Amino acid sequence: RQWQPDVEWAEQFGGAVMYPTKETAHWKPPPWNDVDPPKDTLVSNLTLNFGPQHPAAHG
Amino acid sequence: KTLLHKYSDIPEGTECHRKAYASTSIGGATGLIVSAYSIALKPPASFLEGVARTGRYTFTSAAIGAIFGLTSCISAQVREKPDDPLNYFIGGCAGGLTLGARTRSYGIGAAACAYMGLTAALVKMGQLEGWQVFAEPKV
């Protein structure tokens, strides 16, 4: 039959860079949904001490 | 283009020293531009590598201009045929040879020899007959 490329041919075009080099030996391919991994917990739940010097704390 | 005016003012095959000085200055100026670009898009670890890299790039470019200018005027001087395009060919290829010396690769220099030598005849070709790269809009 006519030869058809397999995944070994596909991996040649499968990298994030068509011609891998030492500089691009670590460039991960983009996420498939284009949504990069969300950053870890970055909340800013500040802790406040409303007293006992605060007059509203009632002493 | 005052710097390029220096090379054009000096008649090729005559005043070999001044033509050589103009040639290396052109190479050094081009070496400055490429090194400045190189340090920008590819920053080094620190300034010590920064000055080292721009030193290498400028030295190669300045050297290539130096020999090519020297060879061009000296070859036309010894052969007394300044108009001959070959008077730039033996310089252009020789400049490519120096490129191999700086990169320590006989293959790269030989590839540079073939390409630079051809272009060196071509730039002499252009100044000879009528050729203009950036022609003024006439029509």
Binding site: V17, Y19, T21, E23 | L3, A29, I33, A40, L41, A111
Partner: protein, 55 residues
Amino acid sequence: LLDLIWLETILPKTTSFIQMKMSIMVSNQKGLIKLYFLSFLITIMISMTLFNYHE
């Protein structure tokens, strides 16, 4: 030696390798806007200067 050791090396592979080597160099930007805009500063500085584009 002549057909597919040198002739394919002289014109084809040399041109492919030349395009090969520099396409690496013109496609490996690091995405730093600092480096990008610094190159913009170089071009805007050089263009208005020594190449005599000012006159």
